Amino acid sequence: IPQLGQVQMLGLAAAVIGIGVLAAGYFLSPTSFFESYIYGYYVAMTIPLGCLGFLMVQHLTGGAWGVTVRRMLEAGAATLPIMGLLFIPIALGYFDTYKALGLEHPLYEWANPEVVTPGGAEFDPIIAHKVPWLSPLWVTARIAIFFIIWSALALTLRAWSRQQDAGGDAKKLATRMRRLSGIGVALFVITVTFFSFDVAMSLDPHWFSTIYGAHYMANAGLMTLAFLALMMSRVRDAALFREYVSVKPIHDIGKLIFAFTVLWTYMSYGQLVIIWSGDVAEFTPWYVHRTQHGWVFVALALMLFAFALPFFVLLFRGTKRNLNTLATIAGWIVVMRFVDMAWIILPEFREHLWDIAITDVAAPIGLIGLVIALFAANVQQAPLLPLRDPNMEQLQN
């Protein structure tokens, strides 16, 4: 409870710093504000969507780790309609609100008139081919639909586990949450793969990847697991984590952090070795733009500090059974996921490592601060760690 208020205050201060420097970035050049907001919303959306999906994975796979962080996963899932309200500046960014707000071109090349209109000045046929799928009405309808399913999934699971505190729970209400999470896991996988497509992979419409989204799956899950381990360390003295939680779920969550780190580097290496070995010139410009002009050193620092050190440090028992050093690892993971999503998103509009403005730090820290503040408000409104539950006995082993 009180450390939760401390981390909520820290997130609110981070959000205030972010909104101040983001408004300054609008004051200097609003296109830089909008592209930095694209990056900040993507790396802010790594938290609640992974929170939602991991809540549904643990409802499908009932574990002691899942009961340990069910309420924090439900708070992170509860922030989704506020993520819709934070999305809609982007929706203003690529719509007819262009030619206002100082934008020179719209935020996406399909939102551009000339690059998709027939008989226009540009008529780039790769982007003009996908004009039913990538048009402002279609993309806003798709993203709002995905928002509807995610908010329905998250709020229904949260309300059912809020009903779980009374009764009808040892066989009822958990079979209901099991069925809802079972259908929704497939729904969440396809909708957040398509969301990762429309938000990130459509920024350069010349390129595609079918492992994108699954790459975003692993990124969201590993950011989420490190976030969960980070604030699990803060609420150690909540008296109910001390009553029912031991270091065995801590070991389980550190184990899952290790597994998602290796799963993510497996996904990134899979995409890299597929595009690199089969040197076909529609897949290759993504990695040409990502090892040029200084981005190569970010790629090597990503390989050395977000895989090799996080893998090699997390082979051991202490740094998994112990919780403090697991929290330090998780903080390093969260920072390295920020750096990775910088490498994923910022080459599409920055073109240099030295072109990275202060807004590309303002928007991730600010929007993560908004995420953390709404999250820690959502943990406090309910009792954490659902005490009355048919999967309770795995905490007692």
Ligand X SMILES: CCCCCCCCCCCCCCC(=O)OC[C@H](COP(=O)(O)OCCN)OC(=O)CCCCCCCCCCCCCC
Structure token digits, residue 80: 């989704």
x/- map, 99-138, other proteins, by CB under 8 A = --------------------------xx--xx--x-----
Interface region with other proteins, contact rule CB under 8 A, candidates 42-50, 88-96, 98-106, 181-189 = 181-189
How far is the C-alpha of 259 from the C-alpha of 244, rounded, in Å? 25
Q: To 10 degrees, what angle do helices 359-380 and 30-60 make?
A: 40
x/- map, 352-371, ligand JLQ, by CB under 6 A = --------------------
Task: Decide: is 296 part of the binding site for other proteins (CB under 8 A).
Answer: no
- Residues at the interface with ligand X (CB under 6 A): 57, 61, 63-65, 214, 217, 252, 255-256, 259, 263, 394
65 binds, among ligand X, other proteins, ligand JLQ, none (CB under 5 to 8 A by kind): ligand X
Task: Decide: is 392 part of the binding site for ligand JLQ (CB under 6 A).
Answer: no
Of 331, 287, 327, nearest in space to 306 by CA: 331
Task: Decide: is 53 part of the binding site for ligand JLQ (CB under 6 A).
Answer: yes
Of 140, 146, 155, 129, nearest in space to 77 by CA: 155
User: Which CB, 326 or 357, lies closer to other proteins?
Assistant: 326
Near ligand JLQ in 187-216, by CB under 6 A: 189
How far is the C-alpha of 45 from the C-alpha of 42, rounded, in Å? 5
Looking at beta carbons, which pairs linking 142-147 to residues 24 or more positions away fall under 8 Å?
A: 142/194, 142/198, 143/87, 143/91, 143/195, 143/198, 143/199, 144/84, 145/191, 146/191, 146/192, 146/194, 146/195, 147/80, 147/81, 147/83, 147/84, 147/87
Structure token digits, residue 389: 């539950």
**CB 302, min distance to ligand JLQ, A:** 20
Structure token digits, residue 5: 């208020």
Interface region with ligand JLQ, contact rule CB under 6 A, candidates 59-67, 101-109, 196-204, 310-318 = 59-67
Backbone angles phi, psi at 280, to 5 degrees: -105, 135
Binding site residues, ligand JLQ, CB under 6 A: 50, 53-54, 57, 60-62, 185, 189, 217, 220-221, 224, 391
Q: Can you give the binding site for other proteins, defined by CB under 8 A?
A: 61, 63, 125-126, 129-130, 133, 182-183, 185-186, 189-190, 193, 197, 208-212, 214, 255, 262, 266-267, 270-271, 273-275, 277-284, 393, 396
